[PDB]
Structure formats: C-alpha cells, structure tokens
Design a protein around this ligand. Sequence first.
Ligand SMILES: *[C@@H]1O[C@H](CO)[C@@H](O[C@@H]2O[C@H](CO)[C@@H](O)[C@H](O)[C@H]2NC(C)=O)[C@H](O)[C@H]1NC(C)=O
Ligand SMILES: *[C@@H]1O[C@H](CO)[C@@H](O[C@@H]2O[C@H](CO)[C@@H](O)[C@H](O)[C@H]2NC(C)=O)[C@H](O)[C@H]1NC(C)=O
Ligand SMILES: *[C@@H]1O[C@H](CO)[C@@H](O[C@@H]2O[C@H](CO)[C@@H](O)[C@H](O)[C@H]2NC(C)=O)[C@H](O)[C@H]1NC(C)=O
Ligand SMILES: *[C@@H]1O[C@H](CO)[C@@H](O[C@@H]2O[C@H](CO)[C@@H](O)[C@H](O)[C@H]2NC(C)=O)[C@H](O)[C@H]1NC(C)=O
Ligand SMILES: *[C@@H]1O[C@H](CO)[C@@H](O[C@@H]2O[C@H](CO)[C@@H](O)[C@H](O)[C@H]2NC(C)=O)[C@H](O)[C@H]1NC(C)=O
Ligand SMILES: *[C@@H]1O[C@H](CO)[C@@H](O[C@@H]2O[C@H](CO)[C@@H](O)[C@H](O)[C@H]2NC(C)=O)[C@H](O)[C@H]1NC(C)=O
Ligand SMILES: *[C@@H]1O[C@H](CO)[C@@H](O[C@@H]2O[C@H](CO)[C@@H](O)[C@H](O)[C@H]2NC(C)=O)[C@H](O)[C@H]1NC(C)=O
Ligand SMILES: *[C@@H]1O[C@H](CO)[C@@H](O[C@@H]2O[C@H](CO)[C@@H](O)[C@H](O)[C@H]2NC(C)=O)[C@H](O)[C@H]1NC(C)=O
Ligand SMILES: *[C@@H]1O[C@H](CO)[C@@H](O)[C@H](O)[C@H]1NC(C)=O
Ligand SMILES: *[C@@H]1O[C@H](CO)[C@@H](O)[C@H](O)[C@H]1NC(C)=O
Ligand SMILES: *[C@@H]1O[C@H](CO)[C@@H](O)[C@H](O)[C@H]1NC(C)=O
Ligand SMILES: *[C@@H]1O[C@H](CO)[C@@H](O)[C@H](O)[C@H]1NC(C)=O
Lengths: 220, 343, 244
Amino acid sequence: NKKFLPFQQFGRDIADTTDAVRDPQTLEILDITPCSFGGVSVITPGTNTSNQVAVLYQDVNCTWRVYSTGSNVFQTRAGCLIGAEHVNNSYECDIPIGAGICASYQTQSIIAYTMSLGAENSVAYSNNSIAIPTNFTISVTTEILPVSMTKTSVDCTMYICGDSTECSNLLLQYGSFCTQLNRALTGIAVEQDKNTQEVFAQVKQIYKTPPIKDFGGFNF
Amino acid sequence: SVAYSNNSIAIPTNFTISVTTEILPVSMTKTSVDCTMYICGDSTECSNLLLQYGSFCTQLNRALTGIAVEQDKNTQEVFAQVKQIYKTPPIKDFGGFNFSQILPDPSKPSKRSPIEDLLFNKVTLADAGFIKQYGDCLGDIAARDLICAQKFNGLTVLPPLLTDEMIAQYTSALLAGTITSGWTFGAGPALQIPFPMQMAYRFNGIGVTQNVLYENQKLIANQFNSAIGKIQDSLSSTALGKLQDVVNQNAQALNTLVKQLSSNFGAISSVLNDILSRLDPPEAEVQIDRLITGRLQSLQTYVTQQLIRAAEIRASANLAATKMSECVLGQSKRVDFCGKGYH
Amino acid sequence: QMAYRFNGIGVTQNVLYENQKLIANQFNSAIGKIQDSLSSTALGKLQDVVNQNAQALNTLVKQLSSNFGAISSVLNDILSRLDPPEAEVQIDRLITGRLQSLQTYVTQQLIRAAEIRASANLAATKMSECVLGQSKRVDFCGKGYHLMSFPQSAPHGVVFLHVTYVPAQEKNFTTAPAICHDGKAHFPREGVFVSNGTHWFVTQRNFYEPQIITTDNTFVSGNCDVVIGIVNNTVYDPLQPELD
Ligand SMILES: *[C@@H]1O[C@H](CO)[C@@H](O[C@@H]2O[C@H](CO)[C@@H](O)[C@H](O)[C@H]2NC(C)=O)[C@H](O)[C@H]1NC(C)=O
Ligand SMILES: *[C@@H]1O[C@H](CO)[C@@H](O[C@@H]2O[C@H](CO)[C@@H](O)[C@H](O)[C@H]2NC(C)=O)[C@H](O)[C@H]1NC(C)=O
Ligand SMILES: *[C@@H]1O[C@H](CO)[C@@H](O[C@@H]2O[C@H](CO)[C@@H](O)[C@H](O)[C@H]2NC(C)=O)[C@H](O)[C@H]1NC(C)=O
Ligand SMILES: *[C@@H]1O[C@H](CO)[C@@H](O[C@@H]2O[C@H](CO)[C@@H](O)[C@H](O)[C@H]2NC(C)=O)[C@H](O)[C@H]1NC(C)=O
Ligand SMILES: *[C@@H]1O[C@H](CO)[C@@H](O[C@@H]2O[C@H](CO)[C@@H](O)[C@H](O)[C@H]2NC(C)=O)[C@H](O)[C@H]1NC(C)=O
Ligand SMILES: *[C@@H]1O[C@H](CO)[C@@H](O[C@@H]2O[C@H](CO)[C@@H](O)[C@H](O)[C@H]2NC(C)=O)[C@H](O)[C@H]1NC(C)=O
Ligand SMILES: *[C@@H]1O[C@H](CO)[C@@H](O[C@@H]2O[C@H](CO)[C@@H](O)[C@H](O)[C@H]2NC(C)=O)[C@H](O)[C@H]1NC(C)=O
Ligand SMILES: *[C@@H]1O[C@H](CO)[C@@H](O[C@@H]2O[C@H](CO)[C@@H](O)[C@H](O)[C@H]2NC(C)=O)[C@H](O)[C@H]1NC(C)=O
Ligand SMILES: *[C@@H]1O[C@H](CO)[C@@H](O)[C@H](O)[C@H]1NC(C)=O
Ligand SMILES: *[C@@H]1O[C@H](CO)[C@@H](O)[C@H](O)[C@H]1NC(C)=O
Ligand SMILES: *[C@@H]1O[C@H](CO)[C@@H](O)[C@H](O)[C@H]1NC(C)=O
Ligand SMILES: *[C@@H]1O[C@H](CO)[C@@H](O)[C@H](O)[C@H]1NC(C)=O
C-alpha cells in the first residue's frame, strides 16, 4: 500500500535493508519480507539413554512451519511442542520447557506436564485454638558457598606471537593493552587471597581441642 | 533542635501503625541471539565466511543461556521459600483486621488481589504473549512493529518458566501462612494461632507489652485498615519506576542492536546484498569481513552489558529473598530493614 | 553452651537439662546421616568454578585457529611465502583478533570474580554470625531456629553444618488472650494461656510445658470489660498456704 513518488525506486527501513521495491515493468510496489522466522529448541533426555527428541517451535500456533508433523502435537504458551505426549498429572520440573510446562522421560516416551508447586495444605484457623509442639527434632543441613576462583596469568607475547620475532616487534603498538590485562588479572589474583583470608582468618589464635573428649554425649 | 537536659525524658503516649511500600526488581527478560541471522541473514557467502568465529558465537550463546537460567533461579529463590500452598479459611474473622486488599479475589479470571491487579495494570510490558506468528506480521507490518523487526534479525525473547498465575499462587500461600500461623511456618510445621495473639506477640517483639494491643484492639484494627486503604490510594494515584526501568532498558538494548545494523564499519555499504551485487567474491570478502567484525563486536558489547545488568539484578533478587525470609517469615530487629520504625 | 543456645531461641534450659541424652543421640544421628547423605550423593556449586575456569582457558587456547580475516591462522605459514610488506597486514589482523579474544576473557574473568567476591563476603558474614555466635535472622543459618554452625574446608569453597531446631508433634488446645479473676485482667508473662479441656494453664510457645496460673506467671492490667476474648479462671496466689 506504500505510494512511491515518481522519482523513487527502492525503500529502506531503519536498518538500511531494502523493504519495498517497484517492479520496473508493471509499476506496482511490492514489499520484501525475510523467509526465516521463529525459534527452535530441542529437548533431549541424554544420548546415553535414548535418541528420541522433542522439538519446541516458539512461533507456531497449532490449533505449518514445522520440519515434520509426526504425532503428539501439543500447544503451550511457549509454542508448539511436537514429539511429546501430554499428561494430566503434576510432578516436579525436570526439563524446563517454559510458561509453566516441563518435560521428562517417563513411561518409553517423552512427556510434558504442568509443574506442581507443592502439596496443597490448609491450616484450621479458629478464634480460640492454638497449636503448641510437644517434641522437637535437631536437624543438620549443608550450605555450600564458593569462596575463591583459580588465579591466572597471561603472556601476550607468547599467546599472540609465540617465538615469532617479527610478530613480537609488530606487537609494540599494543603494550598498554597487555599492561591493563595483567593489572586486572593481578587484581583478581590478590582479591582471591584476600577473600580466603577474610573468610577463614577471623581469629588469630589457634585453639586446640584437648584429649578429654567428654562433651556430655556429643561426639565431634 | 532537641532540648537536651540531664534530668528530662520524652515518653510517647500514642502511636501510629503505618504501612509503606518497597519495590525490588527480581528478574529481567531472557533473550537469545542467532549469530548467522543477525550478522549475515540469508547470505550464504556471509554464512560461509562466518565459520571463522564459531567459538565466539558459542560463547555469546553460553553467556545468554546462563543469564536465562539465572533469572529463573532468582524467581524460584525469592518466591519458592515454602513448598506448601496454604489456603485461607472461609472464616474471615481476623479480629477486626481486613485483608480483602491483599487476599485473592475469586471474581477475576486470575486469582490476584486488588492491589496486585493495580500493580499489574501500571507496568507496561513489550510482549503481550510470546507467540508472534509469521503470518501475523507479513508485509508492511514488518519494520513497523519493533518485536517483529527484532525477530527478523534473530533477537528472541524467551518466556519465564514460572507464570504470573503461579507467582500469584506462591504469594497467596505465603500470605495465608503468615495470617494463619505467624512466623512458625518458616521454621517447621505450621502451628495455628489467632491473628490478635500473633500481633500481640509481635508487639512484644518491639518492646511494648501485649496488654496495650489487647486493650486498643479496635483502634489498632481501624488504623491498620485505614493504612491499607491509604496505600491502595497512593499506589493508584502515583510509581513503579524501578520495575519499568528494567523493561525499558531491555527494550532499548534490543532496539539499539537492531539499529546498529546501519553502520558501515568502514565498508562501501552497510547491506550485504549491495556488497555482493556489483562486487566479485575475492574483493567483496574484505567488506563482508569488515561488517562481520563490526557486528560481532556489537554483539559482544550487548552481551557484556547484559551480564553486568544481570549481576545487578542478582544483587537485587538476593536482597529481596533475604527481606522476604526475615520480614515476612518472621520479625526483624534490624533498624530500617523492613520499613521506617519498629517492624 | 547448649542450654544457653536453647535459651536463645525461646526454649528454657530445663528442657535440655532433662532431655540431654535424647538431644545428644539426635545430634550424633544427624551427623551420621549427613555423613551418608554426602557419601552417597553433590558439590556442584564448587565443581562449577573449576569447570568454568578450565573451559575458559581451553576455549582461549582453541581460539588460536581463527583466521580473523587472514589467509591463514599460523604465523609460520604467513611469514613463509609472504614478504614483510604484505605479511604485516595478515599479522596485524591476527594480532587484533587475539587481542580481542584476550580482552573478552579478561572481562568474563572480572565479572566472575565480582560474583565470587559477593559469595565470599556472604560466606564471611555467615561465618561471623552463625559460627562465632547465634543468629536470630530467619533462614540465615538454615531452616528453623538456629543453634550453631560448623565450618568445613572444601576445594575453592566453604561448607557449613547448620544445627537447627525444628518443632514436631503438635497438639490441639483451646486458648484465650487474658484471664480475669477478681475484676482484673491477667496476661501471661512469658507464655500463652492453654487448656486441655477442663483446666487452664500457661505454657511456653515452642514447647508444651503446662504450669498453674499464679501471681508470678501473670501480671495485671485493667478490668474484665476492655479485652474481647477473656475467660474466667482462678489465679492461685502462693501466699495463702504460706500463711495457713
Ligand atoms: C493459538 O491460537 C488460538 C486461536 O487460533 C488461541 O485461542 C484463542 O485464545 C483467545 C485468548 O483470549 C481466546 O479469546 C479465544 O477464544 C481462543 N480461541 C479458541 C478457538 O480457543 C490461542 O490462545 C493461541 N495460543 C496462544 C498460546 O496464545
Ligand atoms: C485442631 O482441631 C481442628 C478441628 O477442630 C482441626 O481442623 C480440622 O482438621 C481436619 C483433619 O482431618 C480437617 O478435615 C478439617 O477440615 C479441619 N477443620 C476444622 C474442622 O477445624 C485441626 O487440624 C486441629 N489441629 C491440628 C494441628 O491438627
Ligand atoms: C520425642 O521424640 C523422640 C524421638 O523422635 C522420642 O524418643 C523415642 O521414644 C520411643 C518410645 O519409647 C523409643 O522407642 C525410641 O527409641 C526413642 N528414640 C530415641 C532416639 O531415643 C520421644 O519419646 C519423644 N517424646 C515425646 C514426649 O513424645
Ligand atoms: C562417638 O560417636 C561416633 C559415631 O560415629 C563413634 O565413632 C564410630 O561409631 C560407629 C557406630 O557406632 C562404631 O561402630 C565405631 O566403632 C566408632 N568408632 C570407633 C573408633 O570406635 C565414636 O567412637 C564415639 N566416640 C566415643 C568416645 O564414644
Ligand atoms: C473489608 O473491606 C472491604 C472493602 O475494602 C469490604 O467490602 C465492602 O463492604 C461494604 C460494607 O458491607 C459494602 O458496602 C461493599 O459493597 C463491599 N465491597 C467492597 C467495596 O469491597 C469488606 O466488607 C470488609 N470486610 C468485612 C469483614 O467487612
Ligand atoms: C491516639 O491516636 C488515635 C488516632 O491517631 C486517636 O483516635 C482518634 O480519636 C479521635 C477522637 O476521639 C477520633 O475522631 C478518631 O476517629 C480516632 N482515630 C481512629 C483511627 O479511630 C486516639 O484518641 C489517640 N489517643 C490519645 C490518648 O491521644
Ligand atoms: C487436664 O489437666 C488437669 C491437670 O490438673 C487434669 O486434672 C487432674 O487430673 C489428674 C489425673 O489426670 C488428677 O489426679 C487430678 O486430681 C486432676 N486435678 C488436678 C487439680 O490436678 C485433668 O484431668 C486433665 N483433663 C483431661 C481431659 O485430660
Ligand atoms: C466471669 O466472671 C465475672 C465475675 O466473676 C462475671 O461477671 C458477672 O456479670 C453479671 C452481669 O454482667 C453480674 O450480674 C454478676 O454479678 C457478675 N459476677 C459477679 C461474681 O459479680 C461474668 O459473667 C463471668 N463470665 C462468664 C462468661 O461466665
Ligand atoms: C551414560 O552412558 C555412558 C556410556 O554409555 C555410561 O558409562 C554412563 O554410566 C551412563 N550414565 C548413567 C547415569 O547411566
Ligand atoms: C485431561 O483432563 C481434561 C479435562 O478437560 C480432559 O479433557 C482430557 O481428556 C484429560 N486427558 C488428557 C491427558 O488430556
Ligand atoms: C471469635 O468469635 C467469637 C464469637 O463470634 C468472639 O467472641 C471472639 O472474640 C472471636 N475471636 C477473636 C480472636 O476475636
Ligand atoms: C563432667 O563430669 C561430671 C562428673 O564427673 C558430670 O556430672 C558432668 O556431666 C560431666 N560433663 C559433661 C559435659 O558431661
């Protein structure tokens, strides 16, 4: 529907790509739209257990631009999932498809379902009722936190030029860059030691446990 | 000026129950980029010449996938503290306290509270859904709808794993647990307790005796209801800038990437079709390489800024999760951590 | 020390001084269970650091096969069959490409180092608040009421064994906010009013330990006309038997 002026032949968008073109014989305006469109994802349960896959087409509304149609076509808010069977149950998420849908390798085939948030529960609120425990449990849980990473150093001359003397001579125009890289790496390297010292060196007195292991029944 | 003296004190005779809002971003949009379609498009010669930067493109996609998984991890950490979906009883007798503005409304297609709906209607996203068909924008609609313009260049937005309905269910479960059991559901088996008694306990947490509430229950309930209504009105009147900024920055970055395709980068033209037509392969390779280098550097810049923004959002989400665990699942003694005053 | 930490979470020390054997057995069993839960299955958060660093170095090595727009990716093949004046262009292309690769690696390392520094600061705060003391922050040193923590050394990280208090075996009781005896409203000092159906008692919140309502257990404020859910009971004064 664009109306070109008589002196114009091509049309360009904000990316400078050609969008509208006038046919030089019929003098009608035509639009150019790319042929490729839409995202594609593959869901695999691991190649060491099965070869079967399911493909999720994120720009298709199945109610097509698909590689193959097969069977078990299921529509989700994240796209059209082909190669997986829909179930009405609800389990914990195993492979995240998206938009509340997850996938798993159950009974073999690939199945898709709506993830369950957890067991439904209700607390009996009353105006004059309270719940007070009569017993207790002492539980121990693990919490793992990284503290440091590997310290690395880089030599530009050896990485870029190797033993090439001509390249090494040509590299003298970029020495500030290597100074900067080595400075950053040295900062990282000293920061890791600072991290370890901060986390573990809170106390500077090495207390020792005595041979009297009588802790009242607690065994450490 | 404080009239200081060594034998004078000021002790209050009254109090105010105030409600304040605090906004914290938790996540950002998950994006992915197709190197071939962005740098080259449908150009076979450019696609063949791009095979010298495969490790770079794999690195970009790895970083973007890491960010995408990280966003889901942040949302799960913030909202999935409890794995039991508590429901509020039909007995709405909370001793005079009214939670109708923070409890779900069954008259809506979703199960959102009034205030939640008011918040949802005050933040404008860029993708009304995540299914934009090829036939939906075919023709002059392209290069006019920014989402279609981005998609034609390989810039895709991936949907969140947890939908808004599930997030609302999580929030409703948290609210029901708090108003039905106090802070006991965050440490073990949930134990029921009346809400007056819970508020008396939480008064005891700030150094004021429980008989004050047990004697001023009606006044405190009226003040709480009025404060909730005032919060609703102040939200309706005025903003969610911290949440709008995330979507604005993501959209601006994607549109900047789209617009950056008009740069020559030192070539004779910025369009591969004009380079390929009227130039023969060996001398069009120079221009194609220049364009490839420029566009790959642009993608690197976008990925780096996305990583920095993702780190900032991770900090915000960690703070939000800590604040949830310490103010919603319990009572905080930290000054100015869960509002101004005694929490 | 265990009795003190019990007092820190709102449970009196006599509970532990009476159940010491049970608590000791439970703690030993919990340590044995974490032994097995670690032996059988993972330390992914710590393996990820070494995996990412190794992958970054490996991909830096692998990116030496990129032409970067040159006719070959090996400086020896460029320098042989090309004289300096026209080999300088290819060498410059390769230098620019490899410099960009190094800069990208440095940027990713800086971002990862910032993330690891945040983790290390969190670990330092966690140690200072859970190992060197007892934290009242909810869900900071584990799920439940925090008792203590034990740090363990791990490759490129720290591992905490959080000892927590998790209540169990709850029971139903009837409650009331106040008891008024002689026209005066009595409220509990450090407990809650409960009833097994016929008699009224005051007990601590985290453990069922009923006691008789006396003048030491409660305090007086007002009459029987202000509070809403008041119920009637006798409050035993431990002075009449002492004068009788
Ligand atoms: C795929 O397309 C169908 C229609 O072709 C969509 O179904 C419609 O959804 C709207 C949303 O409000 C309803 O008002 C219509 O009544 C629906 N029509 C039918 C026939 O069901 C469907 O929503 C699309 N898929 C997605 C993920 O949006
Ligand atoms: C305290 O007693 C109440 C009943 O007076 C319990 O609440 C009921 O629990 C049953 C469990 O089978 C449910 O079927 C009812 O729907 C609940 N509602 C009622 C009638 O209150 C409550 O569970 C008891 N407390 C505890 C901790 O179990
Ligand atoms: C509190 O729980 C503990 C264990 O969780 C109970 O101890 C058990 O009691 C049974 C009953 O005789 C014994 O058979 C077990 O051997 C005990 N376990 C241990 C580890 O000693 C305890 O009885 C419970 N207390 C109450 C009041 O119910
Ligand atoms: C403290 O308890 C630990 C529990 O692990 C004891 O260590 C071993 O426990 C197993 C299980 O009962 C026994 O079969 C082993 O024989 C124990 N080790 C040894 C060397 O005997 C540990 O022995 C206990 N310490 C004390 C002083 O009783
Ligand atoms: C809690 O507040 C809501 C309003 O925020 C109350 O709902 C209104 O109640 C009034 C008085 O009966 C009616 O005139 C309105 O039609 C109700 N609708 C609205 C505006 O929500 C609700 O009644 C309050 N809770 C209780 C227990 O009274
Ligand atoms: C403490 O403050 C509250 C509110 O700030 C006072 O309650 C108000 O009292 C006036 C006059 O009696 C009423 O018009 C208002 O409606 C009341 N407010 C509410 C929310 O109901 C209360 O009187 C003050 N008490 C003292 C001792 O000063
Ligand atoms: C509730 O607890 C009271 C505790 O006083 C029980 O009353 C006593 O019960 C014992 C035996 O159960 C008797 O020997 C006492 O004479 C009773 N009175 C007193 C003052 O101790 C009462 O039986 C309990 N009720 C229920 C239903 O368990
Ligand atoms: C709780 O006890 C009080 C006093 O023991 C009761 O107060 C009575 O109130 C009525 C009418 O208000 C008077 O006619 C009586 O004379 C009062 N009692 C006394 C001893 O003076 C109150 O009714 C009791 N509450 C319940 C629920 O039984
Ligand atoms: C995966 O397959 C490999 C080789 O087939 C095998 O060695 C490995 O044990 C498998 N993994 C599992 C979890 O079975
Ligand atoms: C699932 O439940 C729906 C309810 O509408 C029903 O139509 C359908 O037959 C059931 N089976 C599956 C797995 O879809
Ligand atoms: C529960 O309801 C009863 C009667 O409706 C009332 O007397 C009592 O005060 C209510 N409970 C609370 C905590 O207000
Ligand atoms: C230490 O020994 C005494 C008696 O010898 C005992 O009563 C006490 O419980 C022991 N200490 C501990 C911690 O068990």
